[PDB]
Amino acid sequence: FVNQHLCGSHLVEALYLVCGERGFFYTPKA
Amino acid sequence: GIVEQCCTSICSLYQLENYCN
């Protein structure tokens, strides 16, 4: 689920499920 | 970064939570 190559919207989708109501921040260039 | 760690290589639950609020 979380253990696979996750790029683009797939990684934004994974972060969304994991952080839940905590939110997250996506910064590809950092 | 999260792209290097989870995209160009394989992600983990441990590194994914470093990006939550």
Curated annotation (Swiss-Prot), chain A:
This is Insulin B chain. It comes from Sus scrofa. The gene is INS. It comes from the Eukaryota.
